[PDB]
Structures are given as C-alpha cells and as structure tokens.
C-alpha cells in the first residue's frame, strides 16, 4: 500500500496564529493524464465522522472557510490554517485516493497557552463501594498545561504499579487546560491492610512533586 | 438532502459476525460507490473496501480479504458491511462513506456504528460518590459494558468546571469512568450536586447526590 506520513503528530498554536501540517506519500499521487493529485485533508472532532476540508490536494470543499488551504504535488503536501480559530481544534488526517485508500496517522491541533500547574485532589473510597468488597481511590489533577503529567501512587510509602489506570480529558474549550483522573483499585481486604494512601504528582508547572494523602 | 444513516451499535462475542447497514437517502445511489472505513478507539482511520452501487462490484483491502463482505440492496437504497470471525481487536467505530468516479474524496459520511467485540456481557454501572476557596467533587461510574455512558450534573444546569473523563477498560472487561466538578467551597452547605448517569446499552439511569 501507499504509505502516508504526517508531521508533526501534535501542534499547539495561539488563537490567530498560523498552523502548518505536512503529509508525505511513499509514491506520487499525480495522474499525469488528469493533472490531479489524489490527496485529501479531513478534520475530525470527538464523536463525529471526519469532515472533508480539501480534495485534489488544493480544492476547498463547499462551506469550508478560506483560512484552510492545501498545497503540494507529487509526494509532499501541506495543509495551512492561516489564522487558528477556536473551532479549528481537532485532529487532521491526510488521505490518498490514487490507489485504494490510505490515511496518514493524524495531527492533533490544540491551543497553546502558558504553563499551568495542576490542582491535586484525592478521594477515599465511598462507604457504598466498600460495602461491596472493593476500594477505588481517585486522584484528580485539575486544569494543567501542558498535557504531560505523572501520577505515582504510594501505599504506606510503597510505590504502586499495575493497580491503577488513568485517563486525560481533551483540551478544555474555555481555558485550554487538561485534567487527569487516576483510579487505584484494591480489594476491601487489601485496602484494610494499609493506612497511608497517597498520590504524588510531577508536572512542569510544579517545582517539586506535590503529594496528597489520607489515612484510611 | 443527502444523508447516510447507519444501523445501531452492536456487541459481539469473539468468533461471531456482524453486519452493519448504511441507508442512503436524498440521492440516486447508482451514480456512487460506498466505502467502509473503521476506527478503533483512539486510533487511525482504516479503509476496508468499496462497492460500486450500480453493478455491485467490490474491492476489499488486503487486510480484510476473505473476512469482509460488502453488498447493496438497490430497492432499499442500502449498503451493508459484514465482517466475520470477529476478534477483540475488531472493536471499532465502522463508517460508511460515499465516493464516485471523478471524485476520489468522501463528502458525506454515516454517523458511525460502534461494534464492541468482547466476551463480557452487557452490564449497567454502579455509581459511587467522590465526596468533597475551591472544592472538587464527582462521581465514579464503575463496572459497565459496553461503551458509552453519559454524565451530566444537576440535569445540565451545572456545566462550568465539569470534566468527564474517558473510560478505562479494566482487566475484568468492564469499563469505568469518572466525572468531576469544581465549585466554590462556600456552596457546599447550600447547593446540592447530583450526577446523572445514563447507560443506554442496558437502559440504566442512575442519579447520585454527592454530599460532603
């Protein structure tokens, strides 16, 4: 198959600033008899199908704002957003249709902002859950930037691994930050074998890691 | 008004087959091709194949040769994708999309059909409180299958400061997610905070009042 390589994988720009995404194909997409390059750019937001922006490398779909434009020929193509608007935050994909169909890996476009340290909160299991035999402890890292953050669970100062899972929100439309939730899961019997439950958080906005903890 | 409307979400066990429909409205399908493209959660778009809606000729991607079947019913203005010998790695949103000779682009897509492939059985969530100048509180929506769940706060009256996180898939094969909100700590004694959880796959609705 034709291989499609997008770069960069992620881009952060301020509102009103230029954004450029690149796409390289492993062979030329140009049909010399038609003069067409069979390269298309799609925008995808969560919960939606992709939306066509640009086809034949440079032809803009109906209704697409003219701040979006496509350029290139042969094996090198570029999608430019001349001035980023809030509604342009999304994942962009290139796609060739010269021979079968193949998509690039996507580029995620986000709003750049200043570094923001997380606010950290820890939640013990509820009495309702414990009645059922299980203990989930939740650590929340709220409203931080950039996305990279590290949570380390400690139980009686013993570092934990494998018994937690975490996930991160997409960028908040109002303040351009992220949040992260981590859940530490233990059986009730195991939970009652220990006293100190702590989540240690490392983030660029913190000059040293912050720990929140409680005693069972 | 051109539309592509797909059939509802599916849950399947490994080894089963699934058949997804794509009903075309508002154009003459015979001038078009229907394509199928899938997207595993968080992953790349993956083309599966096409059918020429005039003559029913098909072309399948090498990765699905021998496993996928694309068909169309002219009188029903509907195309179908059937994928057999399902594995857990076939969990994905499946899209139909139209194309045509001369175009080589997808101008109209179906809304997507989630197919979850898992040995797990449909199960609604347990909802537990995450009790609380700013305070955080929330709800833990635990042990459900399949996706999705929705969470609102105070029936949608509380939206500022709400974060509802992506679900994680536990070793049990059941999903868990949390939803949190930050609020003025001075409000904890006077304002009530209720998380409203819906799990349409199991027709489960739960509300939980989160108290200090």
């Amino acid at each position: 198959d034709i291989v499609m390589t997008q770069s960069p994988d992620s881009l952060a720009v301020s509102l009103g600033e230029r954004a450029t995404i690149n796409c390289k194909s492993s062979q030329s997409l140009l049909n010399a008899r038609t003069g067409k390059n069979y390269l298309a750019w799609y925008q995808q937001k969560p919960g939606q199908p992709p939306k066509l922006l640009i086809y034949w490398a440079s032809t803009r779909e109906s209704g697409v704002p003219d701040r979006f434009s496509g350029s290139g020929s042969g094996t090198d193509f570029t999608l430019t957003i001349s001035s980023l608007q809030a509604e342009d935050v999304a994942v962009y994909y290139c796609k060739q249709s010269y021979s079968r169909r193949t998509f690039g890996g996507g580029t995620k476009v986000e709003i750049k902002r200043t570094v923001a340290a997380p606010s950290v909160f820890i939640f013990p299991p509820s009495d309702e859950q414990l009645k059922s035999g299980t203990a989930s402890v939740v650590c929340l890292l709220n409203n931080f930037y950039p996305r990279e953050a590290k949570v380390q669970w400690k139980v009686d100062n013993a570092l934990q691994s494998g018994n937690s899972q975490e996930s991160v929100t997409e960028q908040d439309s109002k303040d351009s930050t992220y949040s992260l939730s981590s859940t530490l899961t233990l059986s009730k019997a195991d939970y009652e074998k220990h006293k100190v439950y702590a989540c240690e958080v490392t983030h660029q906005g913190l000059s040293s890691p912050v720990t929140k903890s409680f005693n069972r | 008004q051109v539309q592509l409307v797909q059939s509802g979400a599916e849950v399947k066990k490994p080894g089963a087959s699934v058949k997804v429909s794509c009903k075309a409205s508002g154009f003459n399908i015979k001038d078009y091709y229907m394509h199928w493209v899938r997207q595993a959660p968080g992953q790349r778009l993956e083309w599966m194949g096409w059918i020429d809606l005039e003559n029913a000729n098909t072309i399948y991607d090498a990765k699905f040769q021998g496993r996928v079947t694309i068909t169309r019913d002219t009188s029903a203005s509907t195309a179908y994708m059937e994928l057999s010998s399902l594995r857990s790695e076939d969990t994905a949103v499946y899209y139909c999309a139209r194309d045509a000779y001369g175009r080589y682009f997808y101008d109209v897509w179906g809304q997507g059909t989630l197919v979850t492939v898992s040995s797990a059985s449909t199960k609604g969530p347990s909802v537990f409180p995450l009790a609380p100048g700013t305070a955080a509180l929330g709800c833990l929506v635990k042990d459900y299958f399949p996706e999705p769940v929705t969470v609102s706060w105070n029936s949608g009256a509380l939206t500022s400061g709400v974060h509802t996180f992506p679900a994680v898939l536990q070793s049990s094969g059941l999903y868990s997610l949390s939803s949190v909100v930050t609020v003025p700590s001075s409000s904890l004694g006077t304002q009530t905070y209720i998380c409203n959880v819906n799990h349409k796959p199991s027709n489960t609705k739960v509300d939980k009042k989160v108290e200090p």
Partner: peptide, 7 residues
C-alpha cells in the same frame, strides 16, 4: 474507484 484509473 482509483484516481490512477481516471481518464
């Protein structure tokens, strides 16, 4: 349909 077969 494939772009490389367009006439």
């Amino acid at each position: 349909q494939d772009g490389n077969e367009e006439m």
